[PDB]
Design a protein around this ligand. Structure first.
Ligand SMILES: CC(=O)O[C@H]1C[C@@]2(C)[C@@H](C[C@@H](O)[C@H]3[C@@]4(C)CC[C@@H](O)[C@@H](C)[C@@H]4CC[C@@]32C)/C1=C(\CCC=C(C)C)C(=O)O
Ligand SMILES: CC(=O)O[C@H]1C[C@@]2(C)[C@@H](C[C@@H](O)[C@H]3[C@@]4(C)CC[C@@H](O)[C@@H](C)[C@@H]4CC[C@@]32C)/C1=C(\CCC=C(C)C)C(=O)O
Length: 556
């Protein structure tokens, strides 16, 4: 019996939490109530399997169970595992048509919290999990514990509003970031594969643990991959389990891995795990040999490459990464691929050594591109400020892929612009990994949102073509020369007066949605003419909106 197995390991509470998340991430449309019932019924059934390990169907696999339980409310169900299961995975909506989630006044939240606590918190998980079908579950529990703590304390404060609001904003961001990061994770695994996920894991960990040994890292990677392999496929319980052991393991062998892990291992499970996954890189090992030594100068290169290819590259990657925390994980993989491609042609040549001898020369180009992209992009940002810098990115991208839906273009660009204040404040050493990897995340949203209703084939190419090279791929794109402009419409710019109420941010976002609709209508337009109309539109609002009783001003 598996249900039993997992129950003993996670416990009543957590088992109850994870299972809620799984259902919320599968049938994002069903109401909170029907989820609860199924969660209990399923939990109930679990308690019996603990006693008798052969009762009803305690012998079955998780899926069969969870699958039939939902199939009592949910074509996915007209099949049988594994068929039945994966149908569900393919139907997770990344942009569900759920209603905006507004928050009642502070007083209500606190009463609702104080009265019933469990429900309050289960509601929390239900909402986040149904809107972010890929949210790294184990991690969601961490945010839940943090969420409870937010209220547990703020509600006994004086000015609750003052104490909560902030902590609440801090969680929306951090939780939003967490979700993107993981969506990329899953996307890697599901679209590109374990190997892909593995390489990324190798470089990234190797960067954080310069002192760990290739054989040590490789272990951490083989395990990590499994966690995520698991979490993404919906095996949320096993993911949470395995993830825990992995944390137990990293803490036990601390000395073999990093010296910054101390503070992480001296904390509760949940916080322990979050701490590790976010720890800063360990200091770099003192006297380290030159890469050129074993990977370009040695005459035994091609041989080793032929004996254990994947291992060799893994070593190459590990060795370059560990000593280059100032590069982004994508630049590394990129270099690593350049190396592999070279060995391939060079090894089947007359005098291999002479062929692959000047390989580091070809890295120079790939290494500067990002650096220049970053210097440039920050200089600009530094002069325009965040809002104007986003606008710069909004025009640029819209001209690039005019087909994309204005809403997507607005969010993506806004996000892309956040990189400015998110990274440009760091010294050159930490700027690239900060910047280019953050971009690969944002670009992944765009890729997934698009994937739903693919309209631009230029976006499709860049996205499917190569994971590691997307950011470059998009930067290539200039302006679509086949795009035949849109024709003004009224149904395209509903202006009804409900716009003098909205928050400041809600304004910019409207002033932004406009800017895109403009360019969508006048690509050939110029960055000079552009701001001129944009400025007139701002007056109309300012006008009409505080122009006595006028909903017609909008027409006039
Ligand atoms: C405007 C605002 O402040 O919204 C906040 C406030 C918010 C709607 C929150 C998401 C979720 O907890 C909400 C529920 C329904 C959660 C369950 C119950 O306990 C409610 C009594 C509670 C009230 C509003 C709250 C607390 C917010 C979010 C979501 C961001 C988070 C992530 C991971 C993407 C937000 O900041 O956008
Ligand atoms: C330059 C600037 O900051 O303008 C901002 C500021 C702005 C002129 C605003 C439109 C409108 O509320 C304005 C009125 C007259 C609304 C009625 C009253 O309460 C005034 C006391 C108020 C002051 C200025 C304000 C708040 C802006 C807009 C319009 C954007 C809205 C949408 C839907 C695209 C803008 O960002 O362009």
């Amino acid at each position: 019996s598996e249900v039993a197995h997992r129950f003993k390991d996670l416990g009543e509470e957590n088992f109850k939490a994870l299972v809620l998340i799984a259902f919320a991430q599968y049938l994002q449309q069903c109401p909170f109530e029907d989820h609860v019932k199924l969660v209990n019924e399923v939990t109930e059934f679990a308690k019996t399997c603990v006693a008798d390990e052969s009762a009803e169907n305690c012998d079955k696999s998780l899926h069969t169970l969870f699958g039939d339980k939902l199939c009592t409310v949910a074509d996915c169900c007209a099949k049988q595992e594994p068929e039945r299961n994966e149908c569900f995975l393919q139907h997770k909506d990344d942009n569900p048509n759920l209603p905006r989630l507004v928050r009642p006044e502070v007083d209500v939240m606190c009463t609702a919290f104080h009265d019933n606590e469990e429900t309050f918190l289960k509601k929390y998980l239900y909402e986040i999990a149904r809107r972010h079908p890929y949210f790294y579950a184990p991690e969601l529990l961490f945010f839940a514990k943090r969420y409870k703590a937010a209220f547990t304390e703020c509600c006994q404060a004086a000015d609750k509003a003052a104490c909560l609001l902030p902590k609440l904003d801090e969680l929306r961001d951090e939780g939003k970031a967490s979700s993107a990061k993981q969506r990329l994770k899953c996307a890697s695994l599901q679209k590109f594969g374990e190997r892909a996920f593995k390489a990324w894991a190798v470089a990234r960990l190797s960067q954080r643990f310069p002192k760990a040994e290739f054989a040590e890292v490789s272990k951490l990677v083989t395990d990590l991959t499994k966690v995520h392999t698991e979490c993404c496929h919906g095996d949320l319980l096993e993911c949470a389990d395995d993830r825990a052991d992995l944390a137990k393991y990293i803490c036990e062998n601390q000395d073999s891995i990093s010296s910054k892990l101390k503070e992480c291992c001296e904390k509760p499970l949940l916080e322990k795990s979050h701490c590790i996954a976010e720890v800063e890189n360990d200091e770099m090992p003192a006297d380290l040999p030159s890469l050129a030594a074993d990977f370009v100068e040695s005459k035994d290169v091609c041989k080793n490459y032929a004996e254990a290819k994947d291992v060799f590259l893994g070593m190459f990657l590990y060795e370059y990464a560990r000593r280059h925390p100032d590069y982004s994980v994508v630049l590394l993989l990129r270099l690593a691929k350049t190396y592999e491609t070279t060995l391939e042609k060079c090894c089947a040549a007359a005098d291999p050594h002479e062929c692959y001898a000047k390989v580091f020369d070809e890295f120079k180009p790939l290494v500067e591109e990002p650096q220049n992209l970053i210097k440039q992009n920050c200089e600009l940002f530094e002069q325009l400020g965040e809002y104007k810098f986003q606008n710069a990115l909004l025009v640029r991208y819209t001209k690039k892929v005019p087909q994309v839906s204005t809403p997507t273009l607005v969010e993506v660009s806004r996000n892309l612009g956040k990189v400015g204040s998110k990274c440009c404040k760091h010294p050159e050493a930490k700027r690239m990994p900060c910047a280019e990897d953050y971009l690969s995340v944002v670009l992944n949203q765009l890729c997934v949102l698009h994937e739903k209703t693919p309209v631009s084939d230029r976006v499709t190419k860049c996205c499917t073509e190569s994971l590691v090279n997307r950011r470059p791929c998009f930067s290539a794109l200039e302006v679509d020369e086949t795009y035949v402009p849109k024709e003004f419409n009224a149904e395209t710019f509903t202006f009804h007066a409900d716009i003098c109420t909205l928050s400041e941010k809600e304004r910019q976002i409207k002033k932004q949605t406009a800017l895109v609709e403009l360019v969508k209508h006048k690509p050939k337009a110029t960055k000079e003419q552009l701001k001129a109309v944009m400025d007139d539109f701002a007056a109309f609002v300012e006008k009409c909106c505080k122009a006595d009783d006028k909903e017609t001003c909008f027409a006039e």
